[PDB]
Amino acid sequence: DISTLPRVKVDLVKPPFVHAHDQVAKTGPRVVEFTMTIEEKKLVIDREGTEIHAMTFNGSVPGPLMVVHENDYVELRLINPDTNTLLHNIDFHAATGALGGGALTQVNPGEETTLRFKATKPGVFVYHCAPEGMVPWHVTSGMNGAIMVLPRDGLKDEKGQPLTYDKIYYVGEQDFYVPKDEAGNYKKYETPGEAYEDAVKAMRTLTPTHIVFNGAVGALTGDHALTAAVGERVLVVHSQANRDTRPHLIGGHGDYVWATGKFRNPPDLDQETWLIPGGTAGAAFYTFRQPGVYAYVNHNLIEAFELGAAGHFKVTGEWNDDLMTSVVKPASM
Template identity: 25%
Template sequence: MDFHDIESYQHPIVFPPHMPPPIVHDGPMRVQINMDTYIRTKPIDEESCFDWWTYNGGSPGPIIRIRLGDVLEVHFTNNDQSGMQQNIDFHAVEGPGGGSSLLTVNQGQEKIAIFKPLRAGLFLYHCAMAPAPVHLAQGIKGAEGYNFPEHTDESIGLLADNLLAEPGDNIRIFFVNAGPNLVSSFHLIGGCWDRVWREADLISAPAQAIQTTLVPAGGCVVVDFQPHVPGTYTMVDHSLFRIEKGAVKFIHVKGDPLSRPDLYASGSGHGLENCEACKLHPK
């Protein structure tokens, strides 16, 4: 069947931590997404700004969510103000450059490429123009997912940059290590990953009860956590010096941490105590 004979729909532009809506179509579809790239200056703290090289203004770029059997039609325009060439290497695309050979665009140019992903999973996409480590470090990357696990569609409360949940919720995290150089030891302080689709292998059954999972540079993982005890949990790279570089996020589970004395209690009548200016265990 020719790609053009397949019914098409426009993929929405949705940035993490939000997720594109669940897929409702039955048969294969031609999923069209309009992507572009430009430089966007944004603050990274109170004092400094950074010139992000973005997809659609985001770093990371929009999440692409399709189903195996669909074809992906990417319309890619280079709106980069500096005149650089840019492209997209999709880790899920089989063929030279993961598609980047078809999507290398000059300033002001648009190219269209059509791909049929062959494997389920969560994948990185990124710009692969030389020098690729520089392009990645400048932020030009994103995530694509094919056949996410069941029950990926429930919404989750967001509190600023951090996750807000209730005891008993299933918290699912789609974690991408864009690299380009270092591996990540993804750990949850105060909890444990109940299910781990290691290296985002969504075809095999998930591993269970993993304290720290290794995510390679240019790789991903999908994890579930079902909290029982209220309180604040901290997602870190257990190479903990990276906390000082910002590699830390929190899951706030509503309620009193001492409301589950069957699981977590003081034997001496003391309350919770955290060190001053603690970046790991905020109240």
Template identity: 30%
Template sequence: MKSRKNYSRQSNSSTGVSRKQFMKNIGGAMLTGSIMAGTGFSLNARAAAAASPKTDTTASSAVEVDRIAADPTAIPGPIRRNTPKTHEIELVSREVISEIEDGVQFHYLTFGGQVPGPFIRVRQGDTVILTHKSAPENVLLHNVDFHSVYGTGGGAEATFVTPGQSQTIKFKAMYPGAYIYHCAVPRMDYHISSGMYGMMLVEPEEGLPEVDHEFYFGQNEIYSQQLAGEKGMHEFNFEDMRKETPQYVLLNGEKQAITANRRGALKVKKGEKARIFFVNGGPNLSSSFHPIGNVWTKTWREGAIASNPERFVQTALVPPGSCGIFEMDFPVASTVHLVDHALSRVANKGMMGDIIVEGPEDPEIFDPNYSA
């Protein structure tokens, strides 16, 4: 049995850029590859061939999209089967322009036109036929490194594509857990910072316990030549990335994306349970992931779902390039703030999301109006 999934968000506008500019970008990537050959990140023969277009078509500049923040609820449902299957998945690299916050534009590099990239869900033992495609309007070289894959570069060397090209790999999901995938070209830090990361969940053969909600979040830093909040187009700042001093630290690609200030908070009901899938793209900063006004009832650090969970963890450290799986109970009506507890990232750099717990108050657990 096969399932087909296409992870591509359609764009709505574009403007032209010359083939000369396209070749300049490719040439820069090739040069960087040769410089980095000693580091183990050189371009392979397939990438070199991909960087030599066989047609005289022109590329287009990045298109504008209204929203870059991935919807935390838009993920495939839990797997309810006992046998392996084969999935045919298309993952599309898209270069887009969108807003970090109102009036602040940024040139994002994405999988599927969203940050984090599409949530991919399979079962241990499943076979995946994955096609990585580069949208024809792109100008840069892209590939994918899956931490869930046994094989050279996690598939990175086999998935290099230039605009309009595609490459297909086949692999078996051998080990369970939540794993990051990310672009792994020579300037991978720039590509990941700009949004090229996501999660693949490999469910264990026995599946996951039932919960009322599942939510998907990703954290990354943005390095800009402009100050945070300054209106207009923000240009990427490579020097600040080298120094690891970002202007923004974001949850789902936008400042306070999943709050009433931006795209709206998530809502649950008192007494329900939620599972949180969290991926830290980085590329540089670890996240001290914490739910203000709650606690992680169960925590699987590094996304290691085959391990026994820790219980009642207040703050979980998630390094860049890794994931976490968390469960939360909601015993009282409240608003839970999801933050990185390096709190300057909340106060000054935009890293926060909200879950509103609806229901009657329970003064036996929490009484905000208590008087003796």
């Protein structure tokens, strides 16, 4: 009887940070209550000032990472304020039935709904908007995020021993299809419905104009670089709701990788690069061994360094010359 279970309210935080949670469940099954408010907003996605109408869950691209344990219930209050202009809904790939919830959560501006589902399968999963006849348009406008369903006993390695992360980050990777004039210039629009009328043609090229982490070129750099210390164990959750990606930590590895995101499977070990299919979340565990700057990319390096799918870590601590050293620094002899 679900009414006899504990209810716990969670306040979500902005990616790439993740709300506070316990890896090992410290209670029995609960009803975990989340509220997300839909926001349509203009977003500047590149250094050039290119502007799109973003369709967001909770004001961000990606939407926030939700975290529960296996056989908890997710209870989502989804709010579509009348300041928005479109009909939206939500499909959880973690959920079973009703198109992942999409059939039950269609909210017009001025409406709200509350969906409950049982998180029966452990892993990281995409969630995304999916309105009939407008699915790729909403998704590729940024209206996607992810949910992590932890095993009740936390994460385990390929031999059944614990893997405990010290830090967790959520990297949402977004393909955008910004329409262009005949010369190749990106268009801007006053409303989402104006933007929509060039969108299907732009999408049908299957060629993104931009591919970004955390909603913009350079978003996970500078004052917003990801951080760690030598010795720290970091889980990087990575989603792509519409298009394949191939994450890579430049100067590191994925020590343990669930490339298709599902924790009942043993992780792949020692990955350089892994394929997260479009429509999937994956997760990589790494223990930092060297200080300094790292880049974290989609390893189609064009997509990374030209189209925006690149962020940075800044890592503190002790350089290990056994692991790597410059024997003779660059010089002319």
